[PDB]
Amino acid sequence: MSQSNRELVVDFLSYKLSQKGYSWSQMAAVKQALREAGDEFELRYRRAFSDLTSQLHITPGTAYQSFEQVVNELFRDGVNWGRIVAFFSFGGALCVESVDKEMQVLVSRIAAWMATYLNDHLEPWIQENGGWDTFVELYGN
Amino acid sequence: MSQSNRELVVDFLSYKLSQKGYSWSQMAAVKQALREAGDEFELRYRRAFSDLTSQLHITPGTAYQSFEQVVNELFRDGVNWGRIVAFFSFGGALCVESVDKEMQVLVSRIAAWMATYLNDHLEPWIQENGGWDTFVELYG
Ligand SMILES: O=C(NCc1ccccc1)c1csc(N/N=C2\CCCc3ccc(-c4ccc(OCCc5ccccc5)c(C(=O)O)n4)cc32)n1
Ligand SMILES: O=C(NCc1ccccc1)c1csc(N/N=C2\CCCc3ccc(-c4ccc(OCCc5ccccc5)c(C(=O)O)n4)cc32)n1
């Protein structure tokens, strides 16, 4: 119950500060930058590219390594911030299609796969290019 | 500082799911009822009351006890769902003033004080009045 209470407070204060357009922490600023970049990417750029969800055809039998081999296609010509945004959008799309197909049980493993891929394959590039601070500096507020 | 790749993932996926009417967490209906009740309270009903923030000057040296004794004033004549809503709004107002004062870092402290107050002073009343799912039935 105590953890739920904390979660209510955090949600309420985040929502209220966001509603006023206030940036209160580097973490909040990174998350806001990513949300907005994903929205812009999905609206106006994603349809130009081959649909990576068509390569995975996620099932409850899909393993991390199958996700990883499909994501490697997105980074076949290297890492940039745009492709990192596209990676988040791809994960978001796997979750949305999972829930659309009455397989919400996949949502938690998709999140773990995304974390694993970021930590294993993108973290060195992120640090080399000024960390998430630079992402916010170029694409945030 | 964003010192967690997993936190960015969970945040982004929560957002993307919400845009399709789907929920990351089970607390989703309460969060949506509390945000809407907060917005509604602040837009007109709040204007009737003395501004409780004028009694607090939150700095890195302010004790939890100072916050606790000002918040108690909300519940002087009992706990009800509206006063719980007002408590959250009050918390939100404190955070906005904290950022405006260049004390952004105190937002997380205020969050910690609110969760502490909620757990000590309000959790018993909440349990004894049908929990958050009643709040959702009334304000959702
Ligand atoms: O979500 C996805 N699919 C599901 C879906 C749902 C609904 C509709 C369509 C598809 C998804 C995300 S991704 C993707 N395929 N992309 C691939 C295919 C494999 C190879 C590949 C190779 C490079 C790139 C890529 C992606 C983004 C890129 O930049 C984005 C710039 C930007 C940033 C912020 C906001 C707007 C725009 C770039 C680039 O410019 O280098 N290059 C992308 C794919 N599919
Ligand atoms: O955020 C606050 N202040 C900063 C601020 C910013 C901008 C503008 C004005 C103030 C704030 C939240 S609070 C407050 N002071 N309120 C006090 C003063 C001390 C005594 C006190 C005592 C009872 C109540 C109270 C609060 C809410 C209440 O019900 C709300 C019902 C409702 C729900 C959903 C939507 C709309 C309305 C009630 C009640 O009717 O019981 N009673 C309230 C204060 N200040």
For residue A118, count CB atoms less than 10 angstroms from its CB and return exposed for 0-12, middle for 13-18, buried for 19 or more: buried
Cα-based angle A27, B22, A58 (whole degrees, multiple of 5):
90
Closest CA to B74 of B64, B88, B63, B87: B87
- Strand ranges (DSSP E) for chain B? none
Q: Best mutation site among B3, B9, B40 for testing chain A: the one with the most A CBs within 10 Å?
A: B9
Task: Write out the DSSP string of A64-103.
Answer: HHHHHHHHHHHTTT---HHHHHHHHHHHHHHHHHHHHTT-
Task: Write out the DSSP string of A14-66.
Answer: HHHHHHTT----HHHHHHHHHHHHHHHHHHHTGGGS--THHHH---TT--HHH
- Nearest-angstrom CA–CA distance, A82 and A21: 24
Residue A45 · residue A91 · CB < 8 Å: no
Q: Any CB–CB contact under 8 A between A123 and chain B? A: yes
Per DSSP, B49 falls in state: S
| Residue keyed to tokens 């999140």 | A111
Q: Count Cα neighbours of B120 within 13 Å in the Cβ-side half-sphere.
A: 11
Domains of chain B by residue range = 1-140
Q: For residue A62, how many other CB atoms are within 10 A of its CB? A: 17
Check A34 against B1: CB less than 8 A apart: no
Q: Six-digit token pair at A124?
A: 């060195």
Q: Six-digit token pair at B110?
A: 């205020």
- Nearest-angstrom CA–CA distance, B2 and A125: 16
Q: Any CB–CB contact under 8 A between A30 and chain B? A: yes
- List residues near ligand 2 (CB under 6 A): B 37, 40-41, 45-46, 49-53, 73-74, 80, 82-83, 85-86, 89-90, 93
> Which ligand lies nearest the alpha carbon of A87?
1
- Nearest-angstrom CA–CA distance, A141 and B22: 28
| Residue keyed to tokens 């870092």 | B105
For residue B74, count CB atoms less than 10 angstroms from its CB and return exposed for 0-12, middle for 13-18, buried for 19 or more: buried
Q: Which run of H or E residues covers position A107?
A: helix A107-117
- Nearest-angstrom CA–CA distance, A84 and B10: 15
Residue A37 · residue A22 · CB < 8 Å: no
A78 in the Ramachandran plot: left (φ > 0), alpha (ψ -120 to 50) or beta?
A: left
Q: Which residues of B touch A95 (CB under 8 A)?
A: 13, 16-17, 22
Per DSSP, B75 falls in state: G
- Nearest-angstrom CA–CA distance, B85 and B135: 10
What was the experiment behind these coordinates?
X-ray
Q: Any CB–CB contact under 8 A between A25 and chain B? A: yes
Residue B41 · residue B82 · CB < 8 Å: yes
Residue A90 · residue A52 · CB < 8 Å: yes
